[PDB]
Each structure stands twice: as structure tokens, then as C-alpha cells.
Amino acid sequence: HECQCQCGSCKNNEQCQKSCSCPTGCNSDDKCPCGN
Ligand SMILES: [Cu+]
Ligand SMILES: [Cu+]
Ligand SMILES: [Cu+]
Ligand SMILES: [Cu+]
Ligand SMILES: [Cu+]
Ligand SMILES: [Cu+]
Ligand SMILES: [Cu+]
Ligand SMILES: [Cu+]
């Protein structure tokens, strides 16, 4: 999905901007699954 994360790993990360698997509201790296 379109990426609307505010975590450090994803915010302005071009790799997952249009291919993000995170839960909505994924705002913390500690619980971020992106690219798992
Ligand atoms: Cu995302
Ligand atoms: Cu991401
Ligand atoms: Cu993330
Ligand atoms: Cu992302
Ligand atoms: Cu993601
Ligand atoms: Cu994310
Ligand atoms: Cu996130
Ligand atoms: Cu995430």
C-alpha cells in the first residue's frame, strides 16, 4: 500500500513508498515490520 508511516525506517524512504506492508499508523521503528 501507499506508505504513510512516520517511523524513521520508512519516512521519505523511496524503496517502500508504493509497496509498503506496514500496519497503518506505523510510527516507530521498534515495531516496524517493513521488509521483514
Ligand atoms: Cu510505510
Ligand atoms: Cu517502509
Ligand atoms: Cu517503518
Ligand atoms: Cu514506506
Ligand atoms: Cu512499510
Ligand atoms: Cu512502514
Ligand atoms: Cu513504520
Ligand atoms: Cu513499518
Measured CA angle at 6 (ends 10, 26), to 5 deg? 85
Resolution in A: 1.4
Measured over the CA atoms of residue 5, residue 10, residue 11 and residue 14, the dihedral's sign is: negative
Separation between Cα atoms, residue 8 and residue 31, nearest integer Å? 11
Nearest ligand, measured from the Cα of 27 = 7
Single-letter amino acid, residue 19: S
At 18, list the grid cell.
Answer: 508504493
Ligand 1 is an ion; residues with CB less than 5 A from it: 3, 5, 10, 20, 22
21 marked as binding residue: no
28 marked as binding residue: no
